[PDB]
């Protein structure tokens, strides 16, 4: 009952996975060899074998060996099943068409049957958690190949999707706009709730809240994983107001295509700061409505809120939460749509946020993850389709995609479909 | 797993190659005997990229050594690492190329290529998954320029989808040792623009400028120049040999680096570079590693990038470093220097980050610049060529090998077409 | 009561036998000298002499000395009766006609004399277990000479037959198609249930399940024997639902000539995976219906199932098996014929699978051997009669067979009789 | 138990034979005295295949030694292993064959064959079950070509159902020592095509090419060529002398190797072969052992198999190896080289695998190719023959022995019939 299959794709998805499974193991008290010293709280994320070893309900997929061979060699080599860690020979080269048409076309059969052997091992099944990069060749092209299959083989099941999305200024690739726009069909047609996240926004949160002047990716992935633990904590633990994975969607998603919430977490804080402020429910609730804590570089004040899920965990009480969201309704800078008079879905769970012992983030009695559908996110799309337009006006890299089996017209058909999503988020604000 | 086949042609290609094998054997911890003696499991994890296992745990590097004279094979085989190579992969003639492209391509190397290509097959069929070919040569003289581009043509026809990746030392006016250098290079660039997926353009004038104005070496030898080249050859493959925060295969470079198919003539560089008397006074940190790496003095071709614009730059960093600091510096560079990058590409810098810096360095960056300034290297060759060709000077040595005067017309025509395509985006 | 005479013919049958008798000795606790330290469980496979020595109910036959002289010299030299290890002077040369007409014609009346002296020591002999290669000269020609005699001498007794059959691509001989097609009269007229096995299918099972990158024949024979231990387990041991060797046939065989089941075994697993793997009754049942575990290179989804015998052994309970086969009836990719509404014969036996101590195959609480009559097997016949057709159109090797006393018309009469079997398996699917 | 009778004819047949007895005595662990001194029971288990047991546990080889001159008997009897043979089995004349086939077949050897054949009876009657005859000879000169094919005819008539298996060193244009080689060989091939069950075609040109290109021998003797031949002679009988995963008798080879009765002229080879300076650079494993075994440079007849197609290849492996790995490689070869195998046979490769590799190797493979390219070996001999015969040159030496000119017309007629049957299936 209440299982989730977690699929970690490309380097970004696998490295976020290596932080997610670092956290879930601590939170459930599972050793890095999969054993558990001394309730079924682990059952959402781990299959229990008769030997007394908890094996994760995960799949790790990359078209090249390097990152998963590191998972097969590091402290978690004993945890994972040796063929839920899946690797090809050939890198996708930041080319969507290698991921989707040419290279991922071979490994897909092995991936899909290893997913079947998890889904036939779940007694009921809540959904899929799919982790990837929008800018990658494996991230965009293999996830879009895999989701098209999962959306015919598992059509009823909720597909939740965690995406590292291109920034306003920070970028690692020249072709990041092409791979992201080609992905917009995947999220629109074959996903149920898609959590965009941005490297540059978390880099700024790290600088302001964690006091870390120059962070790596390990610092980022320890924030991105903490959101999925807080989304799933009601699926795993006792609470005053637990939220089911579809109860979540029935309050987040106002219209079939309007399923791109922002996400944020509070208190993101250094352990040295956390002694000198009290971090009450009202403080951490107000922190979620700061532009300073949004994990996509867009301003929520340039939008309207459609719905907010405030998923609290740890030592919080429904008195305090109602008294807090009453102050958020009083503030005229936080503007909801005219057609959502209720606005807030509240979840409250009794399990505090677990600290990764090597991490930068404080012990706190309370946290909230706020997941928030708002019109503002259309600016993160308006940034990136203006990067796409400069390059497609020249056909600037198109021969690498056409050379690997893609139709040239798919670039126009993807920029077109993105303009129809950017239309839909502007249309519902009125 | 992403095997590479490496090929050395002529004196220069075998000299930059025989130094490259000393550098990557130090990285992977391989002894001059061919035995492993390294510290770390990461050195052994990807040793298959450049080597074969052989009986008794000895390692055999996957190099083919090609020359039309025995004397460079004799100099490599007797050298610091000469015993490492397979005795059957030394493929050679007896009478040299005479510094003649047409001897390389039509006579002396056309005889020998049947004996080369069938060794390139035994190494490529012993690969588990070949990613590409890594060919070292010079565009002056006749062996590297004319036999090496014959061999590129033969391997391209046989392996059309694998990466063809060439390191190409090429002529310049102020550092020259051959009369017919312009002819040989113009006949050779005509093959590189059509067949290679990447060509890394290297200049002895720029390699002496690094030695004099950055390293402050009083008497830099060809052994010191070969050490600068081979550092950037080890640099660009690093991400298939070691783990990293951002992995980039040679193909992940090519997709980001080459906007239009033919604009693949890159210009490499390396950081840190210091005098041994100033390493005590400098910080190797990513901002100082970046200010050097984008310096017109640091790049290994005569083209001042200030005479053009970058289409793409790739910065392949190595070492324990912040992704914020790397992404900050690759942003700050192309915003503060925005007049030197093309403004129809919204981000001109690719980044990659390996977890394993070179032995004895805390950090390194290898730089690859695709720059419209590279027009000035093809232009100065084509203008040295023209003044000889208009009077048919020296052409009896090439037409004696059965080459047409029409092939010189057509190679110089194709050279001006390569210049026109870089000037177009400027 | 409940005896079986096991006849091991040619190199393949003798080397499978050297695995079978390695297994039966461990499983009954008999030393390799035939003694037993400290119930009649051994009685199906071993005669007991008054010294307390258990002698196998086996005949080993080869037309050349080399392989049986190795059995006469290795660790089992003291197990067998010295005159039931039977050898000629002259190899059959991969020529059916040397096995059947010229060389085996001399040894046959000595082979029968041993089988008579074994049958006269039985009391209610259950049947024969005949092990051979379809591609061999002794394998095809001597087995077909012997079976013709046993089918007049012992006409009532069930003749079960385990055949190493030619592969799609893997082959060891040029004339393997000729010897196999000439054998098709033997299996049709003088056999009661014929278990085709393929070297290339077991090589792929070994690669994917056991992770052994480059197996020998000793690895194949330790799976082919494990199937016959699992067929015979109900004859040797206590169970919840024991299956008799004719009860087996009454559920496997729908029509007199339709007696060519596939066979598969689960779990095929090694110690490095057994600890991460689930190994419940439902999983090892579903593994029998994967194309990846069939020991003939044909796809069961290109057929229809007529009947399945699921012969479970070890710690299973009829609750779990009924619940498992209910999921197999639910899956639309596993298609039975319209005329077999029951489909499944279930057997359940309390004795776990024995580990050969030198083997790759793991200790597991449960196994199932699934033996399965399906229309799909006709493709393994359609492969090989297309190899035959190219060579017989040239008469490509026919002078070696005509030169050793065979009628040339027997090649046409054998290709004809195979086309009538390949017709029968297509005819009953409708 | 599958005894072989071995027969040596002329200088070449007694020299490849007297080396073969040194090789199989090393395998079976037999001392030059004839006493057993080996390590292993497996060496002794099948000693009867090539030896007779005698008092004091001395073992005498089942060889018959035939010559028309005493001087090769004197050279064998005095040699490294000469004392091992039976004194009665040296059967010889006094006046030689004069390099004349008709002296061998009609005069000098027709006198001697009554004294040879009655020794072949004493050895064949001492056998428990004879499988065949293993005859070593040359097709040039007069003793091996003309007496050896007389002796094949006499043993074939007396033992019609036993395997007749011949190892036949034969002429080529660039390595020749006789004027009348084409005549002698054409008169001799006319007997081999009718009587033998297998004939292994061997060439001094190909045996020198293996010494130079791949063994890199500084100066190859006839003793070094005889060592290459005798390695393949020990190879093909291995499966009746040692245990294996797949056993193949000489008859199990013939049934698979010979599609149509007369197409039995094979082309042997051996692996590993490697220069003594290059062994350290190698992996011995089945994938690398295969890529040598099918190389046009490794086969012991002058034919490039790329000028034809194979009918059948047999690969008789020896050593501890995987059947998946052997069956994989013998598949990969004939699918990746499918233009070089006939496409009316659905699998062209026979495999066999013995558990006991040659002393001092971890693996070995002996190759047998039946190829339509062997037409080139009979075409070049028939074209040399034709030029001498069109003007009757040297024929008074043959017609002086009472031979007809009609027998030359009929032998070359039968040679062109053998060429036409191999060209037909191409
Ligand atoms: C204590 C200290 O800091 O030593 C340095 C050093 O002083 C300096 C000057 C080194 C030194 O470089 C030179 O002397 C040099 C001379 C001519 C041409 C090129 C280099 C050094 O020799 C070079 C050497 O580099 C390596 O060992 C790298 O692993 C390099 N491989 C080799 O140089 C090499 C040499 C012999 C045999 C095999 C390999 C490498 C570079 C890229 C990719 C792979 C490997 C290093 C760090 C140093 C010394 C030793 C003084 C420098 O080189 C490098 C690549 O770091 C030159 O400027 C840099 C900055 C360093 O500070
Ligand atoms: C230390 C080491 O590895 O020694 C090897 C060796 O270096 C190499 C080069 C050997 C060597 O071969 C030659 O020198 C050679 C020269 C001319 C013609 C043929 C061979 C070797 O001499 C040959 C010798 O082979 C044998 O001993 C076989 O059992 C062989 N029998 C004989 O050669 C033999 C010699 C004298 C008296 C009696 C027998 C054999 C071959 C086929 C079937 C049965 C037996 C071997 C392994 C080696 C040396 C000693 C260097 C090679 O030969 C063989 C058959 O393995 C040549 O290429 C291979 C690869 C080997 O590695
Ligand atoms: N937060 C974070 N972002 C990462 C991490 N790894 C990669 N990224 C982001 O991933 C984006 C690019 O995607 P790639 O890493 O190239 O995706 P990929 O699927 O491996 O692409 P291919 O190599 O082509 O298969 C960049 O914008 C990075 O910032 C990580 O561990 N954490
Ligand atoms: N699994 C397995 N297959 C074997 C074994 N030995 C032989 N085979 C198969 O046997 C087939 C050929 O039959 P042979 O081994 O030649 O049979 P044979 O009866 O000894 O033939 P003859 O020598 O002519 O008498 C090949 O396809 C082999 O793959 C073994 O021990 N195990
Ligand atoms: N970097 C470097 N350049 C070299 C070396 N040897 C020669 N060169 C230079 O580059 C050119 C190479 O041409 P060369 O290799 O001699 O022609 P080839 O032998 O016919 O191919 C020469 O004219 C030299 O200026 C060397 O060891 N290193
Ligand atoms: N391999 C090998 N070839 C030989 C040997 N002796 C001679 N030959 C060659 O092969 C031919 C053999 O002919 P030969 O045996 O002399 O004729 P015969 O004595 O009348 O049978 C000669 O012309 C030589 O070229 C030898 O010891 N080994
Ligand atoms: Mg990737
Ligand atoms: Mg046999």
Describe the overall structure.
- The complex is a heterotetramer, with 2 copies of chain A (430 residues) and 2 copies of chain B (426 residues).
- With 430 residues, chain A is α/β, with parallel strands linked by helices.
- Chain A has 3 domains: 1-261, Tubulin/FtsZ, GTPase domain (Rossmann fold), CATH 3.40.50; 262-376, 60s Ribosomal Protein L30, Chain: A (2-Layer Sandwich), CATH 3.30.1330.20; 377-430, Helix hairpin bin (Helix Hairpins).
- Chain A has helices at residues 10-28, 66-71, 96-102, 104-119, 137-153, 176-190, 199-209, 217-236, 245-252, 281-287, 318-330, 378-392, 399-402, 409-427, and strands at residues 4-9, 46-49, 53-56, 58-62, 85-87, 127-133, 158-165, 193-198, 239-241, 262-266, 305-314, 344-349, 366-374.
- Chain A has a 6-stranded parallel sheet. In chain A, strands 9-12-11-13-10 form a 5-stranded mixed sheet, with helices on both faces.
- In chain A, helix 5 links the parallel strand 6 and strand 7 (158-165).
- The longest helix of chain A is centred in the middle third of the chain and has 20 residues, at 217-236.
- The radius of gyration of chain A is 21 Å and the shape is globular.
- The two termini of chain A are 41 Å apart.
- Chain B has 426 residues and is an alpha/beta fold.
- Chain B folds into 3 domains: 1-259, Tubulin/FtsZ, GTPase domain (Rossmann fold, 3-Layer(aba) Sandwich), CATH 3.40.50; 260-373, 2-Layer Sandwich (60s Ribosomal Protein L30, Chain: A); 374-426, Helix hairpin bin (Helix Hairpins), CATH 1.10.287.
- Helix content of chain B is 44%, strand content 19%.
- Chain B has an 11-stranded mixed sheet, with helices on both faces.
- In chain B, strand 4, helix 3 and strand 5 (90-92) form a beta-alpha-beta unit.
- The radius of gyration of chain B is 21 Å and the shape is globular.
- The chains are: A alpha/beta (430), B alpha/beta (426).
- Chains in contact: A-B, A-C, B-D, C-D.
- At the A-B interface, helix 2, helix 7 and helix 12 of A face strand 9, helix 9, helix 11 and strand 12 of B.
- The complex binds taxol (TA1) (2 copies), guanosine-5'-triphosphate (2 copies), guanosine-5'-diphosphate (2 copies) and magnesium ion (2 copies).
- The site of one guanosine-5'-triphosphate has 22 residues of chain A, from helix 1, helix 5 and helix 8.
- One taxol binds at residues 22-23, 26-27, 215, 224, 227-228, 231, 234-235, 272-274, 276, 279, 358-361 of chain B.
- Chains A, C: Belongs to the tubulin family.
- Chains A, C: InterPro entries: Alpha_tubulin, Tub_FtsZ_C, Tubulin, Tubulin/FtsZ-like_C, Tubulin/FtsZ_2-layer-sand-dom, Tubulin/FtsZ_GTPase_sf, Tubulin_C, Tubulin_CS.
- Chains A, C: Its cofactor is Mg(2+).
């Amino acid at each position: 009952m209440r299982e989730c299959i977690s699929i970690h794709v490309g380097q970004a998805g696998v490295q976020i996975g290596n932080a997610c499974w670092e956290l879930y193991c601590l939170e459930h008290g599972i050793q890095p060899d999969g054993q558990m010293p001394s309730d079924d709280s682990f059952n959402t994320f781990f299959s229990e074998t008769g030997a007394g070893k908890h094996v994760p309900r995960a799949v790790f997929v990359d078209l090249e060996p390097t990152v998963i061979d590191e998972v097969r060699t590091g402290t978690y080599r004993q945890l994972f099943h040796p063929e839920q860690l899946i690797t090809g020979k050939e890198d996708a080269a930041n080319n969507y068409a290698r991921g989707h048409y040419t290279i991922g076309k071979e490994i897909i059969d092995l991936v899909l049957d290893r997913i079947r052997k998890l889904a036939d091992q779940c007694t009921g099944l809540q959904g899929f958690l799919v982790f990837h990069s929008f800018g990658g060749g494996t991230g965009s092209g293999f996830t879009s190949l895999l989701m098209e299959r999962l959306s015919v083989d598992y059509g009823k099941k909720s597909k939740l999707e965690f995406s590292i999305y291109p920034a306003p200024q920070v970028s690692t690739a020249v072709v990041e706009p092409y791979n992201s726009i080609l992905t917009t069909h995947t999220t629109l047609e074959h996903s149920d709730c898609a959590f965009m996240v941005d490297n540059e926004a978390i880099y700024d949160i790290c600088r302001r809240n964690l006091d870390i002047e120059r962070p790596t990716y390990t610092n980022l992935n320890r924030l991105i994983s903490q959101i999925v633990s807080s989304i799933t904590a009601s699926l795993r633990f006792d609470g005053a107001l637990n939220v089911d994975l579809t109860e979540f969607q029935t309050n987040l998603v106002p219209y079939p295509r309007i399923h791109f919430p922002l996400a944020t977490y509070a208190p993101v804080i250094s352990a040295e700061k956390a002694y000198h402020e009290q971090l009450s429910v009202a403080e951490i609730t107000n922190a979620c409505f700061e532009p300073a804590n949004q994990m996509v570089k867009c301003d929520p004040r340039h939008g309207k809120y459609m719905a907010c899920c405030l998923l609290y965990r740890g030592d919080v009480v429904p008195k305090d939460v109602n008294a807090a969201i009453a102050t958020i309704k009083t503030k005229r800078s936080i503007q909801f749509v005219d057609w959502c008079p209720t606005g807030f879905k509240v979840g409250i769970n009794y399990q505090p946020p677990t600290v990764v012992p090597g991490g930068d983030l404080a012990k706190v009695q309370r946290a909230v993850c706020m997941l928030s559908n708002t019109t503002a996110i259309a600016e993160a799309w308006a940034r990136l389709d203006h990067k796409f337009d400069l390059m497609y006006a020249k056909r600037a890299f198109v021969h690498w995609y056409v050379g690997e089996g893609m139709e040239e017209g798919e670039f126009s058909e993807a920029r077109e479909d993105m303009a129809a999503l950017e239309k839909d988020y502007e249309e519902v604000g009125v | 797993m992403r095997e590479i086949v490496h090929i050395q042609a002529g004196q220069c290609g075998n000299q930059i190659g025989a130094k490259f094998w000393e550098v990557i054997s130090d990285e992977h911890g391989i002894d001059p005997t061919g035995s492993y003696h390294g510290d770390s499991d990461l050195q052994l994890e990807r040793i298959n990229v450049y080597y074969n296992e052989a009986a008794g745990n000895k390692y055999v590097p996957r190099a083919i050594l090609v020359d039309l004279e025995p004397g460079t094979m004799d100099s490599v085989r007797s050298g610091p690492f000469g015993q490492i190579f397979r005795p059957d992969n030394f493929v050679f003639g007896q009478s040299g190329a005479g510094n003649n492209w047409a001897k390389g391509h039509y006579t002396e190397g056309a005889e020998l290529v049947d004996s080369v290509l069938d060794v390139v097959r035994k190494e490529s069929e012993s690969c588990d998954c070949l990613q590409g070919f890594q060919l070292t040569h010079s565009l002056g003289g006749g062996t590297g320029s004319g036999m090496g581009t014959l061999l590129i043509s033969k391997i391209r026809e046989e392996y059309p989808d694998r990466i063809m990746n060439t390191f190409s030392v090429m002529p310049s006016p102020k550092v020259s040792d051959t009369v017919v250098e312009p002819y040989n290079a113009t006949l050779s660039v005509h093959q590189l623009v059509e067949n290679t997926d990447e060509t890394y353009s290297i200049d002895n004038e720029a390699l002496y400028d690094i030695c004099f104005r950055t390293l402050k070496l009083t008497t830099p030898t060809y052994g010191d120049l070969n050490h600068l080249v081979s550092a950037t050859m080890s640099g660009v493959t690093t991400c298939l040999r070691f783990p990293g925060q951002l992995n980039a295969d040679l193909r992940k470079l090519a997709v980001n680096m080459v906007p239009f198919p033919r604009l693949h003539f890159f210009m490499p560089g390396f950081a840190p570079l210091t005098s041994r008397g100033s390493q005590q006074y400098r910080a190797l940190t990513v901002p100082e590693l970046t200010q050097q790496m984008f310096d017109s003095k640091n790049m290994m071709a005569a083209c001042d990038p200030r005479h053009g614009r970058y289409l793409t730059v790739a910065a392949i960093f190595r070492g324990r470093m912040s992704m914020k600091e790397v992404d900050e510096q690759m942003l700050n560079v192309q915003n503060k220097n925005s007049s030197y990058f093309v403004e129809w590409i919204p981000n001109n810098v690719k980044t990659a980050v390996c977890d394993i810096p070179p032995r004895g360095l805390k950090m390194s960056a290898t730089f690859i610049g695709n720059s419209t300034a590279i027009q000035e290297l093809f232009k100065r060759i084509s203008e040295q060529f023209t003044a000889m060709f208009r009077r048919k000077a020296f052409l009896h040595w090439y037409t004696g090998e059965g080459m047409d005067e029409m092939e010189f017309t057509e190679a110089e025509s194709n050279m001006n077409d390569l210049v026109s395509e870089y000037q177009q985006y400027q």
